[PDB]
Structure formats: C-alpha cells, structure tokens
Design a protein around this nucleic acid. Structure first.
Lengths: 188, 189
DNA sequence: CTGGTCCGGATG
DNA sequence: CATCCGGACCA
C-alpha cells in the first residue's frame, strides 16, 4: 500500500489506467473517496481530484483545466477547498484567492478524468475513470458561478508530469504498449 | 408538507382526489416517485403505490387486489422497493417463499393510487388521471412465475382498511360529489 | 463530481 | 410500437 496522505503518483499505476467505477479508483489508492471530488487534508494539502463534469462552467484544455470546489449557498475556502488551495505556491488567501509565484513549486495533485466529464470536456475518456497524471495549482479565486449563480471557489490546474498525457500520440502509444484496458470489478 | 417517509393519508388530500399527471400526485405528497410504482425504503416500509396496469396478470376486486414488484427481464428479487412493501406485512420477512400476515390489519398502511392506465386490467380504475383510493394493507406476498411475462415476480395481496369510503361505492361517490372533487390539471394546461 | 432504479409523457 | 428526455429517490 501507500499512506492515505501520499503526494504524487501511486506506485504501479501508470497514466492511462482506467477503471469502470469510483470504488475501483479508491481501492487502487489513486483517489480514496468513493464520492467526493477532492481528496485532501485542510491543513496539509490535496492529494487527488476527479473531473466528472459536475460544474457546467468548467473548462478543460488537457494541459490546463479549471476546477471547482465544493460546499445552493456560497462556498468557502474550508475543508477540501482549503486543502487544494494549499497546494498552490502562494500564501493562503480565503478572501480573494492567490496566484502562484512559481507554479511548478506547488504540491502535486493526481488527476482522474471521468467519462461523465464529456459533459464539458473533450479530453475526458469515453468510459470509466482514467488516471491522467500530475497537475499543480497555478491559482485559485472566488467567483459567481455562471451556470449556478452562487459563489464558488475555482482553481486553475496545469499538468506537470514526466508521464505523457493519455490523449497525445505518445500517451496513446504507451497505453497500447502497456495493454491498458478498462478494468471492471471481478465478475462485473 | 409531510416528511417523505410519512405513513398513512396525506393531510388535506381526501380519497377520490384525482390528478391528470403523475408529477402532480408527487407534488401533493401522495406518491413521491415520478415514475416508479412503489415508494418506500427497504429497511423501513412502503408508503404508497400506483396501480397502472403494467402487469397483465394482476387482478383487482376494489376491496382487494394483487400487485407486482419491480426490478423485473430477469427474475425479480425481494430487494429495494419490493422488500420495502413486504416489510409492511405483519409477518417475518421471507425472501425465499414470502409470508402471510398473522393479523393483516396490524400491517403498515399503504396509500394506493389507481391510474386510468389501470383500465387495461381493472374495472375500478378511474376513466381519467390518477385517483387516490385510500389506505390498504399487505395481507401476504409470495414469489411466482408471471403468467403473462414468464419470469419470476414478487406478488402482493393488498386489502383495504380505511375509514374514508372507497371512491366507487355509493357513499364514496356522494362524498366526491359533496366535496366537489374534480380532475386536476397543472396550472395553465 | 455515486450508481442503481424506475406502473412517464410526448412524439410520430 | 420505438425512441427520447429527463428527474427524483434511495442504497
């Protein structure tokens, strides 16, 4: 195993790894919570997050994407929201957010793109949940959701991984080379 | 407003009340699901159900009727909503062969809505819309091969036990009239 | 930022 | 009759 609060890639799980259900992603250690989009500790940082299209105003360019906190009424920079913000190379600011000094100095975040992400993203997988590698918080800030109309906390993530992204020619060749296929639970 | 897990009649909604669409029945609190035939919770009981003639082998005598579980197609199982309705029966739960109530009137109450779509199998269904017919209780339930569909279904016997008279009786008809109960459409429709 | 389930209603 | 367009509810 690895500890629940492990930063960085999970040993033995290559980028391009794909599981049918969230619980499988949880078993593999890649994203512990079965439901929540963010795994983190509010005084340490965030270890991983899931892109599943929950917010219609989010955008995804593959190398970069915006992401939304949780917590309808206004969100606050608390709990998991605070945790992800702490990954950014910048002082914590729960009033106007912050932009990183040197973005690559941020703590790494495992990113999982779900098929449900096709609602807003062209880079999301056709099926299941795909591990897409390590990203870092460039900046975070509060804003009124265009789609929902209450204050949300938004984050800009930028990929910084030695493993090639699954949609690139190189990443596609590697998935094939490692025979990465959609994993169903035993019997299912 | 009553909680979603309320047993018994909805306050202010008399037997004989009729709504054109299922969503209206849902908004009145009488039957929460917009689509499903059974509202319940599988470790509690069932609160309401809708007769809309989806199973051709069901029978209806007004005071009593048989009802069919869902989940079925493959065989049905005594799970989810099926299990919920079974829990209403005054008897130990038995997911192999079912059970019959010791004292049927001690069972948990079930709100029954008869849909006009029920006229496929029943002469007690209304000509139009969805009608609240009052409180029924599960007398017994058992698994059986559907005569009309060929797979195993869970079947239930429901029996009326309500102080409010049934809509099709002389008394119920008088009462619907006296209360000016009419088919209700959504506003504007 | 689950997953399974579902006795509608409209359309044609 | 087949297909779509969905959500609400619960485990």
């Amino acid at each position: 195993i690895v500890p629940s609060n492990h930063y960085g890639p999970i040993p033995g799980i290559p980028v391009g790894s794909t599981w049918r259900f969230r619980v499988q992603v949880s078993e593999a250690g890649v994203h512990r919570p079965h439901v929540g989009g963010i795994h983190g500790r509010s005084n340490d940082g965030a270890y991983s997050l899931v892109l599943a299209g929950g917010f219609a105003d989010e955008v995804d360019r593959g190398d970069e994407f915006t992401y939304t906190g949780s917590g309808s009424a206004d969100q606050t920079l608390t709990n998991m929201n605070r945790a992800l913000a702490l990954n950014c190379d910048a002082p914590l600011d729960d009033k106007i957010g912050a932009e990183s000094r040197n973005w690559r100095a941020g703590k790494p975040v495992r990113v999982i793109r779900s098929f449900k992400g096709r609602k807003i993203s062209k880079y999301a997988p056709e099926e299941g949940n795909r591990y897409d590698g390590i990203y870092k918080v460039v900046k975070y800030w509060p804003e009124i959701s265009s789609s929902h109309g209450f204050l949300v906390w938004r984050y800009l993530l930028r990929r910084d991984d030695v493993e090639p992204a699954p949609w690139t020619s190189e990443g596609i060749e590697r998935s094939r080379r490692l025979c990465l296929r959609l994993q169903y639970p035993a019997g299912y």
